[model samples]
Target: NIMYDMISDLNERSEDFEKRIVTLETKLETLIGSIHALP
Candidate 1:
């Protein structure tokens, strides 16, 4: 089970990065939408 736990820990670490990336990714969508609106 040691190897399995190691992989499990990897996912937990990635979640922290994913949380921040998701917030920043949403910001891009809003900003791009603004430019697209300039019709």
Candidate 2:
């Protein structure tokens, strides 16, 4: 039961990180796009 709880916690954390990474990637892309658009 302890191991199962630990694994479930890790899975939840991993999902959170995955979503954060996607958000960061999208923000980075937008920043780069704006930089390129500048003269």
The CA lDDT of each predicted structure is 0.92, 0.97
Q: Identify the candidate with maximal TM-score.
A: 2
Model 1, CA-based lDDT: 0.92
Best by lDDT: 2
Off by over 4 Å in 2: none
Per-residue alpha-carbon lDDT of candidate 1 for residues 1-39, written as tens digits (9 for 90 to 100): 999999999999989999999999999998998789885
Where does candidate 2 clash, by residue pair?
A: none
Q: After superposition, how far is residue 24 of candidate 1 from its true place, in Å?
A: 1.1
Q: List candidate 1 stretches off by more than 4 Å.
A: 1-12
Q: What would the C-alpha RMSD of candidate 1 be, to one decimal place?
A: 2.6
lDDT of 2 by residue, 1-39 (tens): 999999999999999999999999999999999899995
